[PDB]
Amino acid sequence: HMRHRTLSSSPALWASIPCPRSELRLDLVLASGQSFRWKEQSPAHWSGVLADQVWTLTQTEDQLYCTVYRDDSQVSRPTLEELETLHKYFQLDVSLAQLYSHWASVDSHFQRVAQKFQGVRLLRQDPTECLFSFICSSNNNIARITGMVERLCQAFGPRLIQLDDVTYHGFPNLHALAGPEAETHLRKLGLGYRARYVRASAKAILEEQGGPAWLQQLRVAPYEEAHKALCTLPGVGAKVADCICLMALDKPQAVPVDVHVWQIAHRDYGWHPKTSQPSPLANKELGNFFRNLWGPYAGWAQAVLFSADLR
Amino acid sequence: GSHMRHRTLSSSPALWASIPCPRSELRLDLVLASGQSFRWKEQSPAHWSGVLADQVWTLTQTEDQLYCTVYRGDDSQVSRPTLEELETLHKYFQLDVSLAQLYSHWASVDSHFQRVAQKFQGVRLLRQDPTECLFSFICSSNNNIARITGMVERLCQAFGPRLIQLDDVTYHGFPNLHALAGPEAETHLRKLGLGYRARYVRASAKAILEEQGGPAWLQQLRVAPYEEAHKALCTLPGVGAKVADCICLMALDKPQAVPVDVHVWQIAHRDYGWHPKTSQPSPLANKELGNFFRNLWGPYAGWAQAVLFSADL
Amino acid sequence: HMRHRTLSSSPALWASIPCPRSELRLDLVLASGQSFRWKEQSPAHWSGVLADQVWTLTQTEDQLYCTVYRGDDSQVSRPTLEELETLHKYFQLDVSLAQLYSHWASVDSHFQRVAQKFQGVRLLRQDPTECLFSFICSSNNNIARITGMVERLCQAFGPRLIQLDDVTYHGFPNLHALAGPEAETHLRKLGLGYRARYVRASAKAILEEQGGPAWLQQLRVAPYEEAHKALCTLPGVGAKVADCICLMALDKPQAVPVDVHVWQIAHRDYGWHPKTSSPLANKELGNFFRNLWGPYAGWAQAVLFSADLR
Ligand SMILES: c1ccc2c(NC3CCCCC3)nc(C3CC3)nc2c1
Numbered sequence: 001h002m003r004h005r006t007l008s009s010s011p012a013l014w015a016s017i018p019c020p021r022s023e024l025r026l027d028l029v030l031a032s033g034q035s036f037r038w039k040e041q042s043p044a045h046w047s048g049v050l051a052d053q054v055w056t057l058t059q060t061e062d063q064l065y066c067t068v069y070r071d072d073s074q075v076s077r078p079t080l081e082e083l084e085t086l087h088k089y090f091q092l093d094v095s096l097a098q099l100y101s102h103w104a105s106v107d108s109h110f111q112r113v114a115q116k117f118q119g120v121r122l123l124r125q126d127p128t129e130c131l132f133s134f135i136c137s138s139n140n141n142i143a144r145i146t147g148m149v150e151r152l153c154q155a156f157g158p159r160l161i162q163l164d165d166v167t168y169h170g171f172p173n174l175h176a177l178a179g180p181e182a183e184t185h186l187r188k189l190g191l192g193y194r195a196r197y198v199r200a201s202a203k204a205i206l207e208e209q210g211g212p213a214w215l216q217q218l219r220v221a222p223y224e225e226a227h228k229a230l231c232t233l234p235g236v237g238a239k240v241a242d243c244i245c246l247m248a249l250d251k252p253q254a255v256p257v258d259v260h261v262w263q264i265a266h267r268d269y270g271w272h273p274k275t276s277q278p279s280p281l282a283n284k285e286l287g288n289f290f291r292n293l294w295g296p297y298a299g300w301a302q303a304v305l306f307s308a309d310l311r
Numbered sequence: 312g313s314h315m316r317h318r319t320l321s322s323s324p325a326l327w328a329s330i331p332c333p334r335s336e337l338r339l340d341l342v343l344a345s346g347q348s349f350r351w352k353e354q355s356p357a358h359w360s361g362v363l364a365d366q367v368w369t370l371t372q373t374e375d376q377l378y379c380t381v382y383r384g385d386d387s388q389v390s391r392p393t394l395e396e397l398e399t400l401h402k403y404f405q406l407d408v409s410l411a412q413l414y415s416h417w418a419s420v421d422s423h424f425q426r427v428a429q430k431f432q433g434v435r436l437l438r439q440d441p442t443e444c445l446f447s448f449i450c451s452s453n454n455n456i457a458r459i460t461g462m463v464e465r466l467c468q469a470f471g472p473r474l475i476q477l478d479d480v481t482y483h484g485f486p487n488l489h490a491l492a493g494p495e496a497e498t499h500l501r502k503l504g505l506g507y508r509a510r511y512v513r514a515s516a517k518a519i520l521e522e523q524g525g526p527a528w529l530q531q532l533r534v535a536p537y538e539e540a541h542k543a544l545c546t547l548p549g550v551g552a553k554v555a556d557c558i559c560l561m562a563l564d565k566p567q568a569v570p571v572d573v574h575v576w577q578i579a580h581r582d583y584g585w586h587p588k589t590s591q592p593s594p595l596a597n598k599e600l601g602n603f604f605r606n607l608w609g610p611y612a613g614w615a616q617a618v619l620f621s622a623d624l
Numbered sequence: 625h626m627r628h629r630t631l632s633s634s635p636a637l638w639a640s641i642p643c644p645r646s647e648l649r650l651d652l653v654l655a656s657g658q659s660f661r662w663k664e665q666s667p668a669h670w671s672g673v674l675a676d677q678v679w680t681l682t683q684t685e686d687q688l689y690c691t692v693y694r695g696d697d698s699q700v701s702r703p704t705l706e707e708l709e710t711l712h713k714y715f716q717l718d719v720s721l722a723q724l725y726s727h728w729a730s731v732d733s734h735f736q737r738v739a740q741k742f743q744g745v746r747l748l749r750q751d752p753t754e755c756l757f758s759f760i761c762s763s764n765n766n767i768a769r770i771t772g773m774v775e776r777l778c779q780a781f782g783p784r785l786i787q788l789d790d791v792t793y794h795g796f797p798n799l800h801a802l803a804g805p806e807a808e809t810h811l812r813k814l815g816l817g818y819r820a821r822y823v824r825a826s827a828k829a830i831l832e833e834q835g836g837p838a839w840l841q842q843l844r845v846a847p848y849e850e851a852h853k854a855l856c857t858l859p860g861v862g863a864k865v866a867d868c869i870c871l872m873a874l875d876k877p878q879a880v881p882v883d884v885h886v887w888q889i890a891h892r893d894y895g896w897h898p899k900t901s902s903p904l905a906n907k908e909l910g911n912f913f914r915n916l917w918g919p920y921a922g923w924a925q926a927v928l929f930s931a932d933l934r
Pocket residue numbers: 032033034137140141142145243246256257258260261299302303306
């Protein structure tokens with residue numbers, strides 16, 4: 001029985017990435033409603049599936065410490081290209097320090113909240129895992145979504161490894177979710193109505209869009225074109241589209257709007273629609289408001305306010 | 312006879328009957344002094360003493376048990392509450408109604424409630440005497456809880472029957488209608504600290520006796536539907552739409568009734584993003600905010616308000 | 625050069641004003657966006673410049689302790705009666721905070737809740753000049769920065785006074801000094817940006833068009849409405865900066881500066897929307913707080929501002 005590593009337990013299996021806590025705070029990012037695959041299995045030691053490998057992540061004030069679980073290879077530390085993966089996943093080329101400052105210069109309200117909530121950045125997620133994760137997110141909470149994605153992976157995705165009493169499965173491919181008994185199984189796993197959307201969307205991306213290459217096209221396509229493309233999918237509206245756009249298709253300006261963004265905007269910015277009334281048009285107006293205020297990284301600024309308003 | 316004291320748990324161990332009441336179904340320190348009834352006081356820590364009908368009680372609680380004692384009088388032999396007297400509490404605290412059934416329903420329709428409710432479990436509605444509630448709430452307009460608590464005592468002393476003394480506290484029942492309808496009622500009331508409202512107390516009392524006849528009518532309104540009752544009470548002088556909604560929710564078993572004022576309006580706007588679908592507070596806009604909370608929360612909307620009110624306070 | 629005093633270090637050089645902690649809390653007043661010239665060099669020991677003298681201040685539950693530095697100029701000694709009377713007026717200690725809080729609480733339920741943990745928040749009576757130019761540097765700016773801007777502005781144009789430890793102190797510049805031809809370039813080199821334009825222009829404008837620093841004293845006598853209009857005619861002085869000066873230097877307690885932050889508080893905590901289709905709306909919000917709080921509405925605002933920054 002292999003067990004979840006800690007930094008003091010076999011430090012001969014950890015590689016480091018020079019990362020200030022001001023740049024990245026794992027405890028405000030990993031289980032804060034972006035990915036649902038990260039668990040604090042032991043204190044300050046976050047374990048989760050990236051691609052087809054398990055990771056455990058921990059950090060000091062100066063460094064990001066990480067180790068990978070590949071029975072397969074000989075027990076060893078993360079390779080160079082595997083460290084490059086984490087660097088990209090956390091989008092560390094981008095300075096959060098400078099973005100925080102740029103947003104603070106125009107938003108008095110962000111200045112106060114951001115003081116207490118440093119190191120909140122956007123993960124760069126796999127489009128497929130991101131799409132189905134957020135189809136599961138409708139009228140749902142982070143704990144229930146975490147449960148539905150785990151069961152989904154254990155039932156459809158391949159087994160990678162077991163660490164303690166935790167079995168880790170990779171995210172299933174479209175074809176595994178598109179099958180004739182997929183909806184019926186996903187309903188047994190407790191997804192309710194979200195079971196129809198998951199199977200249906202898996203089918204639509206294969207037959208009607210030409211499989212996962214389509215999601216890579218959207219990643220390169222402009223924001224507005226990708227958003228409209230996503231909205232053609234079963235169970236994917238403006239909100240889920242903007243979530244995927246922001247977190248998986250490199251559209252930092254994407255601002256997902258629901259009744260909770262409405263609440264923040266109204267209470268904290270005194271925002272009202274300059275129309276009639278939450279409608280599709282007014283939700284779009286709210287998204288424009290924040291883009292006009294914070295600029296082309298409005299979505300990353302939203303991740304800081306959301307992550308804060310969750311504590 | 313013997314000098315009687317306020318009973319605590321250690322003081323009177325054989326003089327306490329217990330009703331199994333989960334602290335999650337009733338937190339006494341969030342109901343008894345939260346602007347519902349003004350007649351309950353924490354004479355010793357965790358111990359609540361006050362009048363029900365024409366008998367003084369003391370109450371306190373653990374996690375599973377609601378502990379209660381009765382001061383019948385110096386006259387009657389010193390005994391523990393009878394079975395019929397432990398029903399009177401059960402009906403007063405409307406403990407038939409399940410708070411976990413309701414807290415869960417409100418949480419399922421209202422995201423905001425869920426974050427508030429977690430730290431304020433056990434908030435329910437007392438089934439008050441329609442008479443007591445009405446005359447307590449006519450003097451409520453534009454006054455805080457502490458001021459009305461005094462008003463209702465000095466009122467109860469002057470016009471109410473002396474029941475018993477416990478320590479240095481003289482407990483009186485709530486006056487009957489006749490007592491308040493007397494010609495000099497306004498003078499004593501005006502002297503006591505009550506404003507022009509003294510006339511409205513005397514008037515509404517004299518008016519209740521003039522047409523209705525007395526407390527028979529207030530039981531007709533308790534069985535009558537919300538529509539008829541709210542309008543009926545709004546005929547009485549000093550009785551607006553708010554005081555009518557308070558009395559309706561707290562005495563006449565109208566769980567749906569939502570009393571609206573500037574503070575409700577404040578919460579509605581800040582926590583729910585509410586603006587009137589009409590003019591830019593008003594009678595119709597207040598009635599709209601009432602409809603809004605009914606249409607969101609259900610037929611126990613007044614009870615939901617009570618949680619947030621007692622949370623805000 | 626010399627050292628920063630503590631009350632326990634050299635007790636001889638400290639005079640004392642009777643003033644309960646409830647009537648004044650230095651830690652909520654001295655670095656809360658009124659004055660940018662006081663720093664807490666030692667815990668409960670705030671040092672800064674008034675007129676052309678350096679002070680350190682500390683307090684107990686009933687005593688405001690103070691000590692003054694006239695430079696190496698004269699012999700070391702404790703504050704005079706005059707200097708104590710100067711310090712009395714600066715904190716406007718004639719005005720009962722207990723009574724104002726009582727009134728505000730009686731007419732505003734929100735204030736009653738917020739005030740509880742933020743007693744002793746009163747308003748300084750600043751020199752018009754120091755105030756005008758400190759709040760010209762305030763546009764699109766936060767306290768920490770404005771402190772720096774004003775310090776560098778003072779170091780560069782300020783009459784030198786004394787050094788206490790590492791810190792060297794400077795008096796506030798006069799108009800003549802700030803209305804100099806190469807004054808903007810210097811202020812731009814000290815990182816004031818566009819504000820440098822406004823400082824020089826206003827400094828020059830007052831001297832020539834309005835007739836010396838006398839003009840600013842004439843507004844302390846003048847009513848709020850005339851005072852506020854007069855200030856808006858100055859470069860880089862709009863409705864908000866004018867109201868700031870009026871409230872904190874011109875003895876108009878009813879003055880309520882309105883910006884986007886006051887808007888958000890007003891909307892969230894009072895449910896305020898304009899009855900309009902912003903200048904006219906800014907003015908309406910000012911009248912709202914005057915109508916709610918009364919003739920010391922600016923002081924009430926100061927309690928909420930100093931609360932909503934902790
Ligand atoms: C369940 C799980 C996650 C979320 C979520 N995540 C945000 C998305 C924008 C980047 C930061 C994370 N956002 C929202 C609303 C848009 C605010 N609802 C959720 C419901």
